Amino acid sequence: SKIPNGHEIISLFESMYPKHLAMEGDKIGLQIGALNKPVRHVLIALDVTEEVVDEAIQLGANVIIAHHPLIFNPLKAIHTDKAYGKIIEKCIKNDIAIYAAHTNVDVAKGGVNDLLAEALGLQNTEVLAPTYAEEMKKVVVFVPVTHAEEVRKALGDAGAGHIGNYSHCTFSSEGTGTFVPQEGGQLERVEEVRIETIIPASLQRKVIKAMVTAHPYEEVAYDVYPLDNKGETLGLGKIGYLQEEMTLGQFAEHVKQSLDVKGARVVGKLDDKVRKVAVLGGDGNKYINQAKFKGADVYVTGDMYYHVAHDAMMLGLNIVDPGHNVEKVMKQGVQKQLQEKVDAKKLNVHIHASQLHTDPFIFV
Amino acid sequence: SKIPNGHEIISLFESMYPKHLAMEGDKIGLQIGALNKPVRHVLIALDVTEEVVDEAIQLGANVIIAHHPLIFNPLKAIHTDKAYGKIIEKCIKNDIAIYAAHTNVDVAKGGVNDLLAEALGLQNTEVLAPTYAEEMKKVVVFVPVTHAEEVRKALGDAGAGHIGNYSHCTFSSEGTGTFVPQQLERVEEVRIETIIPASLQRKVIKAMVTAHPYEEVAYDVYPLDNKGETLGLGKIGYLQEEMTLGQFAEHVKQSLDVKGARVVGKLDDKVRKVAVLGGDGNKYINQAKFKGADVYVTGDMYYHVAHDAMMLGLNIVDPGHNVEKVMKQGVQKQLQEKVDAKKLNVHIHASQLHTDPFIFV
Amino acid sequence: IPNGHEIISLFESMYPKHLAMEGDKIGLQIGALNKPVRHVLIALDVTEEVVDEAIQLGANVIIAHHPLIFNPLKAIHTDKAYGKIIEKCIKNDIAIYAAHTNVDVAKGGVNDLLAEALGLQNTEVLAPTYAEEMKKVVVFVPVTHAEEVRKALGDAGAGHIGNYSHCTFSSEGTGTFVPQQLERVEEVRIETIIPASLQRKVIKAMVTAHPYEEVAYDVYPLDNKGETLGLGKIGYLQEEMTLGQFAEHVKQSLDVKGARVVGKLDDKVRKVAVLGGDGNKYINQAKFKGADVYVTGDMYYHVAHDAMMLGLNIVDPGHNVEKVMKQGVQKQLQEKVDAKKLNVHIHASQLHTDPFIFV
Amino acid sequence: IPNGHEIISLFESMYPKHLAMEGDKIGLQIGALNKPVRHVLIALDVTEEVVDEAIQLGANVIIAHHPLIFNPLKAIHTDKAYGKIIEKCIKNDIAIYAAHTNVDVAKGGVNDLLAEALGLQNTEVLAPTYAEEMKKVVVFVPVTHAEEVRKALGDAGAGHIGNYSHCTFSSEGTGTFVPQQLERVEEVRIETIIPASLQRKVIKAMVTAHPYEEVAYDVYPLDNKGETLGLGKIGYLQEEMTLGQFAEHVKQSLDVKGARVVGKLDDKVRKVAVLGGDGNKYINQAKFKGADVYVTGDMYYHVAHDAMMLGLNIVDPGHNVEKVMKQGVQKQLQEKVDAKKLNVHIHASQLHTDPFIFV
Ligand SMILES: [Zn+2]
Ligand SMILES: [Zn+2]
Ligand SMILES: [Zn+2]
Ligand SMILES: [Zn+2]
Ligand SMILES: [Zn+2]
Ligand SMILES: [Zn+2]
Ligand SMILES: [Zn+2]
Ligand SMILES: [Zn+2]
């Protein structure tokens, strides 16, 4: 086993939560410290409070992966006399790296919103509010029949032609290519195979490199066509169906047990029937129209504003607000996912899920 | 025959004047009321003044389709003591729905500008200010050899592959496909390609997929550089015979039925190529002139813009913005023709009220 | 005896307007171009002295690297030095054409000139700004004429990529059609790549050679890019030198009496980035591309400190060092005009316009 | 043994925060000030070397002319040179206080220092930025105590204008009141001018001296202005010199190895404008105020051409020439701290932080 550096770990985290998934104006990535150093232990956090930093010190963790950015507004100053400046100071003095994974963990499959849908027992889920759809490309490559099969394998293994429940999708037809080699007017002609395969733009670099390697030629002719086809839609929140119909009052209880909270606020008549549920961890005030358009009976989200809640009653949308802190499910979730990746790659790192409770609110 | 609801009528209207054609920032669509109600009479209006509302009420029209949005500036208040708030109040209290059809009516074929150009007698008209080109797509589908022939009929039956004097154009290549369901798998397939305008995309792709074996169809949609017809604001075309600027200005008054007009340019100058754009066309004097217009017909001509026109060497006849009134009988005919085809018993009316605020003296 | 229009058309084929950056002020700034033109003056800055030189030469067009009108004019004040430059251009019918960042970007431009003047080897673009679009042309042809069509396509310049020319790929298949009972024909689908700019010419040649009046062809946008152009160049000295001697080498090469240096005169230098004009924006790109030193003008204090923190050395010979573009463009434009057998003389302003004197 | 707070309070009485320009970044940038402080380091730029000097001195406060944090931090990257400066300030509990344009503006500031270093006579502010507000205080007093009240007013600093002190104007008249039938009394209306800053002190003294518990007084805003402060200084050399010798005189006076000059080395120079830092914005003001030459740093090419067109000469010794503010402020701050009998040592960074070396 090898002790990895921060960059390697981070590079394996980003395989599951890429930075292009993050939303317009979001603040993610390395925020404090450096990653070019041996990392024996990592901490997954929701909020980087001072008590969370104390925890990282008692564990020997020199990298904290947090969901909410520690620096959100850019720092005009670092006041060590203040609670906030003391967190940055504690991180800096103790060589602790702080990495933010914000909206990219909200948007990605297996992220906050999937974790909350599972927790709730929701079935047949769909993205609630689409924010990202990968641009698709058609790669067409020309290869002699001697190397055609080898080139298809390389494209496939590298992830090209992986749409739905089928992988290694390609199409090949035979034809003739012409060329006139130049200085360094003789018309040549060669029977060839035209191989085409679809790719998501993010896989372009890796797929082209594998293709070129397998290809017997040094100078390779291939085309990349942009297509109108989009990849799987990704976005904020999930909308799905409960296993059985319930009233809002008992659904609300189910949210409490299910999401481990002592209290919640509910908008709507507690005796109304609810079957399809929308959930969006964090501040989801902006998606009440989407939730209703998609047909939700109830919407589970945090930070519900008074005026937005009147807007929701007017739409005919029920709401259960278990608090923004229910996104805490992301710690144990990311901890599993990440431990799994570092174990698959023989790395000697222990990942931890912060135990500290960081909900600023107590229901009385 | 049966009585339609507002949404059915509005669908038919929108098939001729698609909403996507409106300028960014325009205010179009349902502005007041609801459309999920029976509609026996519809009134077509340019401006929704209070008398137009009295006219609908009198006809029993519970939908008014208007060219100029009743609500343009969003409402901070509804002051029923002011004339504007009285109009809104009147619509609300008599359950009249107001629907706006603004720049989409200026941009579409058969719209305001085609109507004004036809009224002026213009030949060989072209779009004055391009705003929309339909985009073409190449559709490529993979069908097993056994149903390839059917899929091509299917695609061609929905109009894909109409190139000049030929129809049902598709090209098919024999090849081999590979895939792995989650082992080495090969199928002999046919790659079929056909060209469609983007409007036919949803239709053609239904007729392809439904007529396809796997139903979990492998197909690609390529954007092409090839474009379809161009749409935009205003028309530019030619008079049947040459005339002076003064004769042409008199032609405008007769054609568009106005009592006075304002002319910029020498009345003795000869005119042959005419540009026209109903409404406020100040921003297009340059475009008019770049296209060889001897004279531009538009409304709301402003001082410094008229002086800009003189400098360019472009003559202008301003018969007023109100000449867009031609849209009332135009849309009425188009819409009554449509509703009668679908067998809906609804009467479409054109507002008989003169709404030009200006009187020439 | 040609027009300004024909002479500027030849200039633009070498320095296209689309190469220019976001809010650049290029093109005809003062005057008219539909006038007979016997002499053309190439300049960096249009100073009143440069306008006098033009008058003395009998030149009625000045092509300048720096736009005379950069900020739009709220007035033309004739008792002010600036209004007087404008005044005499007008009174002596001198047309002022601006060629700014297109000359910074294009081949043989300001940065190619500085790089070759510094003796840099294996140069690459520093900061990419343009890449020409490529398209895929696909045409359907009966077998009997496929070869004629491919030849037309290649002779016209399609499929000219890398060390190869006349590259096409043809597949045989079935085309169906119902002439105004589906008819079917064996056909050839020929595809070939083109740069966007060759489209009209290639299509025209392909159509002429096609056996039919109705030609079915498609033009696809590709993500493939043509050649990359940009700002500045990064390359290598033939031999390693200290920062101190490289700095002298810059003064000798670019003929400047002085230069300001950021970094240790004693440390070693081999890879050099250069960008004429104000290149404060690009220190990061320079360091990232591996430059041991960056030659640029107008270096600001706080940006020199940033450069230092990056571990990037600087030699600042002044922005005026772009003067190379004067004899550069003159040579390139005289070659174009002579090839077109036009009787015009292109002159490069001789006037020194660096405001700075080093003490 | 004092706090950072008490030491910074003394600094601010000399360099107030309100003097600073629009979007300036001043005040405590990193650290805390409620810590015992034995040594203070004055710096221009907070480079990693300057932080090391502080550590070596045992200084836990650095007052710098250039804000260490100018652009707000989106991150603190510890493997980057900039993040490392920030890292060690934090790890060694060094507080970084920024004193920017208030030090450019205040008396004895960067521009007073440069002017006196150049030996300029009869200096005036170049570009006005601040003028203290004046108020008129009017108080009503019975005749028997009018004189006591006026004396209180003057001893407290009211009516101190020009070469005069204790200036008041008193009028006699009738005051009416209905105590909780109008009552009337002969009274004196005393008026006097004050600077806005003396208000609390003056009012407090006036009230104490007034014979009554209820004091009727008014404070009026006036358009009268106090002393004007601003950017740069304009003044005269003791004797006329050529532009070439003035340029040497600048290198000798400001201890710089090089300078860039705009203008003819041979023409005559007498009135000089100076502005430390980046003074590109002010060439117009300099010329309008009659400067025969303008000393400033960071001169940009196109702005030198503008200067030329104005007929304004320039000597550019670099922005680093503001280093004078280091021993300047140290001297001024040591004098304040010693007067308050505080046992603190103020040190001026010895490190040379000019990134430019002239070749
Ligand atoms: Zn959150
Ligand atoms: Zn979140
Ligand atoms: Zn209109
Ligand atoms: Zn209108
Ligand atoms: Zn330049
Ligand atoms: Zn340049
Ligand atoms: Zn400064
Ligand atoms: Zn300063």
Short mmCIF file of all heavy atoms in Angstrom, two decimals, chain D residues 271-310:
data_model
loop_
_atom_site.label_atom_id
_atom_site.label_comp_id
_atom_site.label_asym_id
_atom_site.label_seq_id
_atom_site.Cartn_x
_atom_site.Cartn_y
_atom_site.Cartn_z
N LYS D 271 8.99 74.46 -12.21
CA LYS D 271 7.85 74.02 -11.38
C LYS D 271 7.70 72.50 -11.53
O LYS D 271 7.67 72.00 -12.65
CB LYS D 271 6.56 74.75 -11.77
CG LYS D 271 5.46 74.68 -10.72
CD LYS D 271 4.27 75.57 -11.08
CE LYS D 271 3.29 75.73 -9.91
NZ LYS D 271 2.14 76.60 -10.27
N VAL D 272 7.64 71.77 -10.42
CA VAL D 272 7.62 70.33 -10.46
C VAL D 272 6.40 69.76 -9.76
O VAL D 272 6.06 70.21 -8.67
CB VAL D 272 8.84 69.77 -9.72
CG1 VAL D 272 8.80 68.25 -9.68
CG2 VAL D 272 10.13 70.23 -10.37
N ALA D 273 5.73 68.79 -10.38
CA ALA D 273 4.60 68.13 -9.69
C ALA D 273 5.16 66.77 -9.33
O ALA D 273 6.05 66.26 -10.04
CB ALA D 273 3.40 68.00 -10.59
N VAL D 274 4.73 66.20 -8.22
CA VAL D 274 5.20 64.87 -7.83
C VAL D 274 3.99 64.14 -7.27
O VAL D 274 3.13 64.77 -6.66
CB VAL D 274 6.35 64.90 -6.79
CG1 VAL D 274 5.94 65.68 -5.52
CG2 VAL D 274 6.90 63.49 -6.46
N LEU D 275 3.90 62.85 -7.53
CA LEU D 275 2.83 62.04 -6.96
C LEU D 275 3.45 60.67 -6.92
O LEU D 275 3.91 60.17 -7.95
CB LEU D 275 1.56 62.09 -7.82
CG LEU D 275 0.27 61.26 -7.51
CD1 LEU D 275 0.02 60.88 -6.05
CD2 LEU D 275 -0.94 61.99 -8.00
N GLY D 276 3.54 60.10 -5.73
CA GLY D 276 4.10 58.77 -5.58
C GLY D 276 3.07 57.77 -6.05
O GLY D 276 1.87 58.04 -6.02
N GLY D 277 3.54 56.61 -6.49
CA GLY D 277 2.66 55.54 -6.95
C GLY D 277 2.31 55.72 -8.41
O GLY D 277 3.08 56.30 -9.17
N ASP D 278 1.14 55.22 -8.76
CA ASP D 278 0.57 55.26 -10.10
C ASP D 278 -0.19 56.57 -10.29
O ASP D 278 -1.34 56.68 -9.85
CB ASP D 278 -0.38 54.06 -10.27
CG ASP D 278 -1.11 54.04 -11.62
OD1 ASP D 278 -0.75 54.81 -12.53
OD2 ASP D 278 -2.06 53.24 -11.77
N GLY D 279 0.43 57.53 -10.97
CA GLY D 279 -0.22 58.81 -11.18
C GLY D 279 -0.58 59.11 -12.62
O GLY D 279 -0.55 60.27 -13.02
N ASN D 280 -0.91 58.08 -13.40
CA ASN D 280 -1.34 58.25 -14.79
C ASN D 280 -2.58 59.16 -14.89
O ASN D 280 -2.67 59.99 -15.80
CB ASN D 280 -1.67 56.88 -15.41
CG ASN D 280 -0.44 56.11 -15.89
OD1 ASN D 280 0.08 56.36 -16.98
ND2 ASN D 280 -0.03 55.11 -15.11
N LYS D 281 -3.52 58.99 -13.96
CA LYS D 281 -4.78 59.76 -13.92
C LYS D 281 -4.59 61.27 -13.82
O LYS D 281 -5.48 62.03 -14.18
CB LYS D 281 -5.57 59.39 -12.65
CG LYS D 281 -6.14 57.99 -12.51
CD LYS D 281 -6.45 57.77 -11.00
CE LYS D 281 -7.06 56.40 -10.66
NZ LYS D 281 -8.58 56.36 -10.78
N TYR D 282 -3.41 61.70 -13.37
CA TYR D 282 -3.24 63.10 -13.03
C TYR D 282 -2.41 63.99 -13.91
O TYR D 282 -2.16 65.12 -13.53
CB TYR D 282 -2.78 63.22 -11.57
CG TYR D 282 -3.76 62.54 -10.66
CD1 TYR D 282 -3.57 61.21 -10.27
CD2 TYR D 282 -4.91 63.19 -10.22
CE1 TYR D 282 -4.52 60.55 -9.47
CE2 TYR D 282 -5.83 62.55 -9.43
CZ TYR D 282 -5.62 61.23 -9.05
OH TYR D 282 -6.54 60.59 -8.25
N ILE D 283 -2.00 63.52 -15.09
CA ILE D 283 -1.18 64.34 -15.99
C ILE D 283 -1.83 65.67 -16.32
O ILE D 283 -1.13 66.70 -16.36
CB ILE D 283 -0.75 63.60 -17.31
CG1 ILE D 283 -1.92 62.96 -18.02
CG2 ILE D 283 0.31 62.55 -17.01
CD1 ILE D 283 -1.64 62.61 -19.46
N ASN D 284 -3.16 65.66 -16.51
CA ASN D 284 -3.93 66.86 -16.84
C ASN D 284 -3.94 67.91 -15.76
O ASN D 284 -3.90 69.11 -16.05
CB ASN D 284 -5.39 66.52 -17.14
CG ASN D 284 -5.57 66.02 -18.54
OD1 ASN D 284 -5.81 64.84 -18.75
ND2 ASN D 284 -5.40 66.91 -19.52
N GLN D 285 -4.07 67.45 -14.53
CA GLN D 285 -4.08 68.32 -13.39
C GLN D 285 -2.67 68.89 -13.25
O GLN D 285 -2.49 70.07 -13.03
CB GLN D 285 -4.51 67.51 -12.15
CG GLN D 285 -4.65 68.28 -10.84
CD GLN D 285 -5.78 69.32 -10.79
OE1 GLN D 285 -6.55 69.50 -11.74
NE2 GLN D 285 -5.88 70.01 -9.66
N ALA D 286 -1.67 68.05 -13.46
CA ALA D 286 -0.30 68.50 -13.33
C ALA D 286 0.00 69.64 -14.29
O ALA D 286 0.52 70.66 -13.87
CB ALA D 286 0.68 67.34 -13.51
N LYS D 287 -0.35 69.46 -15.57
CA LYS D 287 -0.12 70.49 -16.58
C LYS D 287 -0.92 71.75 -16.29
O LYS D 287 -0.41 72.86 -16.42
CB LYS D 287 -0.50 70.00 -17.98
CG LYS D 287 -0.22 71.03 -19.09
CD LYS D 287 1.29 71.26 -19.22
CE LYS D 287 1.60 72.28 -20.29
NZ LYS D 287 3.07 72.53 -20.41
N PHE D 288 -2.18 71.58 -15.90
CA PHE D 288 -3.05 72.72 -15.63
C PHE D 288 -2.56 73.57 -14.47
O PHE D 288 -2.72 74.78 -14.46
CB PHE D 288 -4.50 72.28 -15.37
CG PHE D 288 -5.44 73.44 -15.17
CD1 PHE D 288 -5.92 74.17 -16.26
CD2 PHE D 288 -5.82 73.83 -13.88
CE1 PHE D 288 -6.76 75.25 -16.09
CE2 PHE D 288 -6.66 74.92 -13.69
CZ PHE D 288 -7.13 75.63 -14.79
N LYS D 289 -1.95 72.92 -13.50
CA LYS D 289 -1.42 73.61 -12.33
C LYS D 289 -0.06 74.29 -12.62
O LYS D 289 0.57 74.85 -11.72
CB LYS D 289 -1.34 72.61 -11.17
CG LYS D 289 -2.68 72.30 -10.52
CD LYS D 289 -2.95 73.35 -9.54
CE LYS D 289 -4.28 73.17 -8.85
NZ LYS D 289 -4.34 74.26 -7.85
N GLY D 290 0.38 74.21 -13.88
CA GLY D 290 1.62 74.82 -14.35
C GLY D 290 2.93 74.04 -14.18
O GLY D 290 4.01 74.63 -14.20
N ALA D 291 2.85 72.73 -14.01
CA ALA D 291 4.08 71.96 -13.82
C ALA D 291 4.89 71.89 -15.09
O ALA D 291 4.37 71.59 -16.16
CB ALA D 291 3.79 70.55 -13.30
N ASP D 292 6.18 72.22 -14.94
CA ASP D 292 7.17 72.14 -16.00
C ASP D 292 7.58 70.68 -16.14
O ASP D 292 8.16 70.30 -17.16
CB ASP D 292 8.42 72.99 -15.66
CG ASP D 292 8.19 74.49 -15.82
OD1 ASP D 292 7.46 74.88 -16.77
OD2 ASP D 292 8.79 75.29 -15.04
N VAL D 293 7.30 69.86 -15.13
CA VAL D 293 7.64 68.43 -15.15
C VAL D 293 6.90 67.71 -14.03
O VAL D 293 6.59 68.31 -13.00
CB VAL D 293 9.20 68.19 -15.06
CG1 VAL D 293 9.77 68.77 -13.80
CG2 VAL D 293 9.54 66.72 -15.15
N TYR D 294 6.61 66.42 -14.25
CA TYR D 294 5.82 65.63 -13.32
C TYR D 294 6.54 64.36 -12.97
O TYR D 294 6.92 63.59 -13.84
CB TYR D 294 4.45 65.39 -13.98
CG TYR D 294 3.41 64.52 -13.27
CD1 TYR D 294 3.27 64.52 -11.88
CD2 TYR D 294 2.57 63.68 -14.01
CE1 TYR D 294 2.30 63.69 -11.24
CE2 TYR D 294 1.59 62.87 -13.38
CZ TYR D 294 1.48 62.88 -12.00
OH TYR D 294 0.52 62.08 -11.40
N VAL D 295 6.80 64.15 -11.69
CA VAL D 295 7.46 62.94 -11.23
C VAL D 295 6.40 61.94 -10.70
O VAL D 295 5.71 62.23 -9.74
CB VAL D 295 8.47 63.23 -10.12
CG1 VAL D 295 9.03 61.94 -9.57
CG2 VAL D 295 9.61 64.11 -10.65
N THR D 296 6.29 60.77 -11.33
CA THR D 296 5.30 59.76 -10.90
C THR D 296 5.77 58.38 -11.40
O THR D 296 6.60 58.31 -12.26
CB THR D 296 3.87 60.09 -11.47
OG1 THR D 296 2.84 59.49 -10.66
CG2 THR D 296 3.74 59.63 -12.92
N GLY D 297 5.23 57.29 -10.86
CA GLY D 297 5.58 55.95 -11.33
C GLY D 297 4.52 55.25 -12.17
O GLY D 297 3.39 55.74 -12.32
N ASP D 298 4.89 54.11 -12.74
CA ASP D 298 3.99 53.30 -13.55
C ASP D 298 3.45 53.98 -14.81
O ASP D 298 2.39 53.64 -15.26
CB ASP D 298 2.81 52.77 -12.70
CG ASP D 298 3.23 51.74 -11.65
OD1 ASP D 298 4.10 50.88 -11.92
OD2 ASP D 298 2.64 51.77 -10.55
N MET D 299 4.17 54.95 -15.37
CA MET D 299 3.71 55.61 -16.58
C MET D 299 3.47 54.62 -17.76
O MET D 299 4.38 53.90 -18.17
CB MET D 299 4.74 56.66 -16.99
CG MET D 299 4.23 57.64 -17.99
SD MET D 299 3.15 58.81 -17.17
CE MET D 299 2.99 59.95 -18.54
N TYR D 300 2.25 54.63 -18.28
CA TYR D 300 1.84 53.75 -19.39
C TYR D 300 2.16 54.46 -20.71
O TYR D 300 2.10 55.68 -20.77
CB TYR D 300 0.34 53.48 -19.23
CG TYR D 300 -0.32 52.57 -20.24
CD1 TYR D 300 -0.18 51.18 -20.16
CD2 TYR D 300 -1.18 53.08 -21.22
CE1 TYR D 300 -0.82 50.34 -21.08
CE2 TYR D 300 -1.82 52.26 -22.13
CZ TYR D 300 -1.64 50.89 -22.05
OH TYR D 300 -2.28 50.07 -22.96
N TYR D 301 2.52 53.69 -21.74
CA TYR D 301 2.87 54.21 -23.09
C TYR D 301 1.96 55.28 -23.67
O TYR D 301 2.40 56.39 -23.99
CB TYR D 301 2.85 53.04 -24.09
CG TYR D 301 3.38 53.30 -25.50
CD1 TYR D 301 4.73 53.45 -25.72
CD2 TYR D 301 2.52 53.32 -26.61
CE1 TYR D 301 5.24 53.65 -27.00
CE2 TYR D 301 3.02 53.52 -27.90
CZ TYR D 301 4.39 53.68 -28.09
OH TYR D 301 4.95 53.86 -29.35
N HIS D 302 0.70 54.92 -23.84
CA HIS D 302 -0.29 55.80 -24.40
C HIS D 302 -0.54 57.04 -23.55
O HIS D 302 -0.95 58.07 -24.09
CB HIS D 302 -1.58 55.03 -24.69
CG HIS D 302 -1.44 54.04 -25.81
ND1 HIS D 302 -1.04 54.40 -27.08
CD2 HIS D 302 -1.65 52.70 -25.85
CE1 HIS D 302 -1.02 53.33 -27.86
NE2 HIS D 302 -1.38 52.28 -27.13
N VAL D 303 -0.30 56.93 -22.25
CA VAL D 303 -0.44 58.06 -21.35
C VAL D 303 0.82 58.96 -21.47
O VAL D 303 0.75 60.16 -21.26
CB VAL D 303 -0.79 57.64 -19.91
CG1 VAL D 303 -0.90 58.85 -18.99
CG2 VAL D 303 -2.18 56.92 -19.87
N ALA D 304 1.97 58.37 -21.82
CA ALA D 304 3.18 59.18 -22.08
C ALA D 304 2.94 59.98 -23.38
O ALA D 304 3.23 61.18 -23.43
CB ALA D 304 4.38 58.32 -22.23
N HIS D 305 2.41 59.34 -24.41
CA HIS D 305 2.04 60.08 -25.61
C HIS D 305 1.07 61.21 -25.30
O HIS D 305 1.21 62.29 -25.84
CB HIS D 305 1.50 59.18 -26.72
CG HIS D 305 2.57 58.51 -27.51
ND1 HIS D 305 3.30 59.17 -28.48
CD2 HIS D 305 3.05 57.24 -27.48
CE1 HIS D 305 4.18 58.33 -29.02
NE2 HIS D 305 4.04 57.16 -28.43
N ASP D 306 0.09 60.98 -24.42
CA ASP D 306 -0.86 62.04 -24.04
C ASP D 306 -0.12 63.19 -23.34
O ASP D 306 -0.35 64.37 -23.62
CB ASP D 306 -1.97 61.50 -23.12
CG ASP D 306 -2.92 60.53 -23.83
OD1 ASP D 306 -2.99 60.53 -25.09
OD2 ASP D 306 -3.62 59.77 -23.11
N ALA D 307 0.77 62.83 -22.43
CA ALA D 307 1.64 63.78 -21.71
C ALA D 307 2.41 64.65 -22.71
O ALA D 307 2.44 65.88 -22.59
CB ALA D 307 2.60 63.03 -20.82
N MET D 308 3.02 63.99 -23.70
CA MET D 308 3.72 64.67 -24.77
C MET D 308 2.77 65.64 -25.46
O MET D 308 3.08 66.82 -25.59
CB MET D 308 4.27 63.68 -25.79
CG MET D 308 5.49 62.93 -25.34
SD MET D 308 6.17 61.83 -26.59
CE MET D 308 6.43 62.96 -27.95
N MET D 309 1.60 65.17 -25.88
CA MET D 309 0.69 66.06 -26.55
C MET D 309 0.29 67.25 -25.68
O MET D 309 0.02 68.33 -26.22
CB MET D 309 -0.53 65.32 -27.12
CG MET D 309 -0.22 64.49 -28.37
SD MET D 309 -1.70 63.69 -29.04
CE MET D 309 -2.10 62.52 -27.72
N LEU D 310 0.27 67.09 -24.36
CA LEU D 310 -0.05 68.21 -23.45
C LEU D 310 1.10 69.21 -23.31
O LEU D 310 0.88 70.36 -22.93
CB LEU D 310 -0.43 67.73 -22.05
CG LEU D 310 -1.75 67.01 -21.74
CD1 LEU D 310 -1.78 66.78 -20.25
CD2 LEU D 310 -2.98 67.79 -22.16
#
